[PDB]
Symmetry: T
Subunit: 151 residues, 12 copies
Amino acid sequence: DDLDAIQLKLQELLASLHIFYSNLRGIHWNIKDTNFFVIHKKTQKLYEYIEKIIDIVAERSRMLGYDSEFRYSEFMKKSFIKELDIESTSNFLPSMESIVCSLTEILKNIFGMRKLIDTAGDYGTANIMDDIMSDLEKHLWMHKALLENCD
Amino acid sequence: DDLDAIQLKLQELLASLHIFYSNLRGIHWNIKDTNFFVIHKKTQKLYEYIEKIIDIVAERSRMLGYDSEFRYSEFMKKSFIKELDIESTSNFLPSMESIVCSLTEILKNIFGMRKLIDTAGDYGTANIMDDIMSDLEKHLWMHKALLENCD
Amino acid sequence: DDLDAIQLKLQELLASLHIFYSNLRGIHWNIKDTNFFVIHKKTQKLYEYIEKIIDIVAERSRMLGYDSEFRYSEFMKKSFIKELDIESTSNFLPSMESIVCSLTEILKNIFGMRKLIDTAGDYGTANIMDDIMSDLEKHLWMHKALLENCD
Amino acid sequence: DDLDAIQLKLQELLASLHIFYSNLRGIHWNIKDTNFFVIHKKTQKLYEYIEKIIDIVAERSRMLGYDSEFRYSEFMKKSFIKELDIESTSNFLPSMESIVCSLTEILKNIFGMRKLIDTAGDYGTANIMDDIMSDLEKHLWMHKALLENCD
Amino acid sequence: DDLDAIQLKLQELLASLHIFYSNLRGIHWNIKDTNFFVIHKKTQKLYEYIEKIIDIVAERSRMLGYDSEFRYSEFMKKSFIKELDIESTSNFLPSMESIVCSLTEILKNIFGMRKLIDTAGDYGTANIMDDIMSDLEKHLWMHKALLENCD
Amino acid sequence: DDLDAIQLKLQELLASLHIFYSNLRGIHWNIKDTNFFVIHKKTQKLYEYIEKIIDIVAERSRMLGYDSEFRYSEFMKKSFIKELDIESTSNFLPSMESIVCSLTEILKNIFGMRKLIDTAGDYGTANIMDDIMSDLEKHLWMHKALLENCD
Amino acid sequence: DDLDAIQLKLQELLASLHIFYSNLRGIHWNIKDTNFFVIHKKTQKLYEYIEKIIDIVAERSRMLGYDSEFRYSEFMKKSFIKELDIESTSNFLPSMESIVCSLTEILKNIFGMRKLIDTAGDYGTANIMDDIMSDLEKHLWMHKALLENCD
Amino acid sequence: DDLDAIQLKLQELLASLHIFYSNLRGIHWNIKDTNFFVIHKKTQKLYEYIEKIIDIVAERSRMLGYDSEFRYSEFMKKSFIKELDIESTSNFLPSMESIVCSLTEILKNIFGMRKLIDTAGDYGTANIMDDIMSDLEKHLWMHKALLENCD
Amino acid sequence: DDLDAIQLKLQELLASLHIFYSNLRGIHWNIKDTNFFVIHKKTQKLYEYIEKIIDIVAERSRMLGYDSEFRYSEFMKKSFIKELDIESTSNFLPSMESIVCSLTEILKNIFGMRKLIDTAGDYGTANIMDDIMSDLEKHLWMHKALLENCD
Amino acid sequence: DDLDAIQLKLQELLASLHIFYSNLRGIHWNIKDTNFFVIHKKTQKLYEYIEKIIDIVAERSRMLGYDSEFRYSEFMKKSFIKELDIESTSNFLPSMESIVCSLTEILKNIFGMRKLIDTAGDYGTANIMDDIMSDLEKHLWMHKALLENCD
Amino acid sequence: DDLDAIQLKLQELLASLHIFYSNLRGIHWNIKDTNFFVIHKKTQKLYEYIEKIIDIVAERSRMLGYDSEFRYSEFMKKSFIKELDIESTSNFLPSMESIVCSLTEILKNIFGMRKLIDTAGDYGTANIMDDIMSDLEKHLWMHKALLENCD
Amino acid sequence: DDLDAIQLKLQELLASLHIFYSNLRGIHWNIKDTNFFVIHKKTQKLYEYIEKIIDIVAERSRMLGYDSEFRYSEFMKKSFIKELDIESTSNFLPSMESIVCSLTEILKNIFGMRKLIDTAGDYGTANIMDDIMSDLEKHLWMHKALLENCD
Ligand SMILES: [Fe+3]
Ligand SMILES: [Fe+3]
Ligand SMILES: [Fe+3]
Ligand SMILES: [Fe+3]
Ligand SMILES: [Fe+3]
Ligand SMILES: [Fe+3]
Ligand SMILES: [Fe+3]
Ligand SMILES: [Fe+3]
Ligand SMILES: [Fe+3]
Ligand SMILES: [Fe+3]
Ligand SMILES: [Fe+3]
Ligand SMILES: [Fe+3]
Ligand SMILES: [Fe+3]
Ligand SMILES: [Fe+3]
Ligand SMILES: [Fe+3]
Ligand SMILES: [Fe+3]
Ligand SMILES: [Fe+3]
Ligand SMILES: [Fe+3]
Ligand SMILES: [Fe+3]
Ligand SMILES: [Fe+3]
Ligand SMILES: [Fe+3]
Ligand SMILES: [Fe+3]
Ligand SMILES: [Fe+3]
Ligand SMILES: [Fe+3]
């Protein structure tokens, strides 16, 4: 019966992942900037890469005993990340820079998670969970480099 | 300004495609049948293939002048295809066989569409739209062969 | 029940395809000419290519509802193309040049077909049927170039 | 002039091979079973493999001095293997199991042959003839394992 | 004798294709912009792709009976597309944007063509002709996205 | 001299791994079920994968200072996993399902181990040891999905 | 019922093969010599190659009717080849040179076998059995070349 | 400012290269000979190879400071090689054998050039210029071997 | 502002890595031993592999907020590893065996590091830092096997 | 001491192989015919293939105990095949057709050999020796097909 | 003893190459510009390419008799190229543009060298030395195209 | 008629190349040393590489007008390199070290040649001739490194 702990949280990320997913395929479909060509391949290269993180993240669930979800009602509700309007351009000089301010929070979520995994004795979970932070961490670095350092 | 005709309908399929998408990633994540191993690879092989149909279908929009959508509110509303509960098993002997009764309707939708394209003079649209029916038609055949012929 | 129209005709080509098939593997096995080496690779490159056209052509049947045939009695009877004797050489200066005068007629058959498809509303059929004429058309051109233009 | 011995027998197998060939492309086109997906790939994987055995077997002829055949009249007559009706299903619990009871006899034919080759001093023939028994022997094993051992 | 119709027009596109060809290898050789590196690979990726469209377009001619041309006198005369001076930069804010305003017109030409093909009963011509519009249509979209939407 | 701790335990898994190894090559050689074809490839895909886990696990030993073993006397004695009789079939509805109830225990063993590694300060050991649990964990999930969830 | 002859002997080699197998993975794990790097890749290249000989050798059994074994009790008993202590070094100047004096005997065993196959009329067995002697013969040559010719 | 010397001559070859280019795609499109198949691939294999020589030759210009041309007016004027009529056949027994008598002269041009490079101290130019003579020299040899030696 | 802790230490390894780097390309360039050929490929295989460890290690810095260094003054000063003279031979029987006694210390450094990472809550750092110890640990093992075990 | 029998004969073929070798690289270097291009690739494809037959044939020697030769004095003396003058053309209508009348005799030599192997109990020798006749037999067939059947 | 001439100068370039090397891995690690993504791949694509130039350049030394260096003291002293501060941005509008003004001088150095090689009779040295100027020359062109032509 | 100069000398190297060729396949077949495995691959890697040098060197002849030779009488006579006895071992501490003292002289021959090419105005010859010295020069360096530096 045990192991609901960090499990119910997988749905937390599992949910916010498919939201960053279609926003990505949104950055990717409407984009209209000078860099274009690239910012068209690299966005694809992201949602394509968090595409693989979404399936496995889902399979961690099944690993234990849980039965993953795929419903949408439970995405546009569970996620700690919201949709992007139909924008204005590719980049965004102000605070929220989606392309930049999106991976930033999930790193916190999982950051949060890992500890509980760093407790409940689920080295298997953290092995891949914390495998993703490395994953997502570079995609953070790379982006805030399209603008400017800081943090 | 022209060309809203078959364009507004792309969103019709564009919408029902991402619904069959995550249902597929649902068949794919919970599945628990004897065939398993295979039906675990082939479902992936489907949503992976209608994944590519979803992006291009979206790019047909941008081809003309339209600006594609990626919002979810406009998927679980626009689509002529609904979500799957958390099922009961892989197959389903009764009428609706999702894995089978899903591709079946979009073929109609597009069937419908094509004519309007088969009129408005958008050979470019139909060249790929009707490129998909061939696409999806085999995936229909293949499935209703897991059960039985008919139609 | 519908769709027997262009379906019963698939068997028409489906039949004449397996006849051009083994004639090809006949040109390919006995050939004894100067070009040889090549006319030995290219014949193979043909029957290997109409090999793939034969399977799919057969799968169009199953697409709809029909159940394809594979019997021989129904090939050496249905086909609008006949066998080659044990020849005399590779080329043939007179009218019928098999290697040349074979693809020529099926283009007519299908030519004929397409219209009925270009009517019954089977864009899926024509999409691949007329996909083959392009296919077979170059293999016509290429050959009548081993001899001389005309038509 | 010599070497008609085992040569006239090549036509014996050469004939029964193209019969098992299209029956295979028959198992492959109509099949409608649960295993499906797999048994749809593996049947293809058979007739694709006895496809290569058919050409070379034909080229052994030309090796010596003989001129191979490709006519059909001489297949549905020479062969020691007959066509399959339009079946009833994929498997078959009774004696003749085509998918199983087909390779079984050619192994005898060739078995028979080899000796004559194992006499006339045609190590080149047997090197590949008996190369095929190994070939076909596993495809026998594999199949009667889909049902049950015995023999 | 027939089929001069859409044939004489192939030379129309066949001509304007080799003009967009070397202009491309012109955009590609002198370019001096910030994007550079990318716009140096993507221009190459264009003329490399319309390179393949030029040969086949030429082979459609030979398909029928016509004998393609390769002379230059008949390019800088037949084409409905003109050469680029030695420019001023990569992009161009005003109306004509070559890199953008070039594919735009051939789409019309062929658009025009197709109908006549969409009449004379040359499904083989249209199958590839209209195969190119899809081709070239995306390269239009992609470009006018380096600047701004509209149309 | 230090580091005998988790080292002597490597032999514990190192031993039970080569036992699951040949049992796998046992499931793989005698198997006779309906799924067959697949379950004949996937079993191979297992023992092939725990084949690589066996060598490296052995090389962790040499990493430190230890000299790995390869003797059999020390496998059919050290292992916490026993051999399979010559079975009865592929699957097994009762408790012990080898194909299923085998990976299950080593996960415990190592589970146990990791802690001691999660203490002695051998992050290098755990990095790969716990790299295997992820490894083996999916192969558990996958299997108990051929039957039914639970745990 | 027949064919126990050379069959019961397959187990003879089948047994001694898995013994040379783990000794190899023993030479491969402890080795500590100057050549090292190589003598570390080539040993792997051996047991990796007799790994494939072990599976097929086992499948010859199933070819006929026999049901292969995988138990260890029946390896450290049936084999005509014994385990290696934990050695002293890589090479060995005296008579028994394992790395050298191991393949040497199985060549005899099989040598012996083949005749019985070279009698019972199992060309399929010998085709691969004697396929292995060529196999193993070079690995003999290669090794006794690391030391000195002779025989 | 310097380096106009051998630079203005690059345009000399750069010009005659695009002329041999489309003549090649002319030999390649109309050809109608016995060798055909081969001479249809090898001509392609030429213009495809002098295609790469044309771009780099153009990039040598940009290397220094020059800005390459792509205009046609400056090809059918600058070149020391003229167009081919719509021929009569593939080969040509008399003096000028295009397929043969074309590479022959550019070897002279460049021959000429190199010296000036073999003077002005542009080892970088000659390194690739004289890289091309080796290039084109074999294509000379190969061709005059389709006819007869001499020179 | 936080996270200077383990960050300032990355420069510690980042520094000693480029020192082992060119010493490697030193072992690699002067080497003159019997093993040669191998020890010429394997040394390359090392510095090529710690080449990738050097860039990422540098990118961990940028991950957080730090701006990596590349200056040399800060390598031949920061590093806890010194240069090799122009040696005497490939191997070295005494204590310091560079090729062996080099990876040995960085394992300590990082060993040291990890703890601080194993505290500050930088699972992302340790995930790759401790990913390297596994990395470098085998290269230690492998080497001290070219000589003798111990430790 | 035994096994000089068929061994001294390997040198017989080993010798005549390197003679057909450089004659091939002679056919290959001077050739001047119409087929050219092909007959320039296929000759290469021969001597490249009998190149591999020459090394292994040599390694059969070392297999046993013999020490292969590589001297030339012992080729232009031992061989039962002689050099080609500097010819007159590619083909040759009369009896000896080298390109054709060369493989023809070695097939006899080995034919002869095999028996002695087919006696002395060297299944390993014959397995590859008779592996070559199949090899060389097709290259015979192929050639006498460039001219005419017969034998 | 001879050949110190151009040899002592290899160290001149060999030295300045490893300086441009880590500056490159400096442009590559800190870069923060709009182009970013591209200029992050292309810089890597440079130092990766002058990485290969550095090793071979070093191996030219060993070619003759010299024993290459790898010490750093002898780089930050021998080189005619200096380190980059921790910059300000990616590009630089003023004179020295590193990314641009770096390859520029080594071309001179080597330019200088070649002559001495173009004298001492070391065609082997110049063959690769002047192989590099072509190398580096394009990387010059490409860069000064990111800004503006000139020279 | 001209160009006999450096041409007659190609035969000089062309001759000594096929002698180093079979000596290589002699070092390669009898070798019996400790390094073995490596020195068995690297020797092959030499004669395989001077194999390609032999064909092209021969094609330089045909480039001009000359008709290459392939006779042996003209190798064991023309060459400035002699055969190796059946040796004593792999290495050789005294002066002549074949494996080492063989490439050494051809470098002189060609050295000699180049000048005459460095005169007669055959930049095409020298481009590849001096392409080989770089080739062979490294194979010199590598070998005299298996022993000791010097020269
Ligand atoms: Fe895209
Ligand atoms: Fe998945
Ligand atoms: Fe999966
Ligand atoms: Fe896309
Ligand atoms: Fe063939
Ligand atoms: Fe199929
Ligand atoms: Fe299929
Ligand atoms: Fe064939
Ligand atoms: Fe370029
Ligand atoms: Fe073409
Ligand atoms: Fe298998
Ligand atoms: Fe290993
Ligand atoms: Fe290993
Ligand atoms: Fe197997
Ligand atoms: Fe073509
Ligand atoms: Fe280019
Ligand atoms: Fe190297
Ligand atoms: Fe990097
Ligand atoms: Fe060639
Ligand atoms: Fe060899
Ligand atoms: Fe990177
Ligand atoms: Fe190197
Ligand atoms: Fe070998
Ligand atoms: Fe060649």
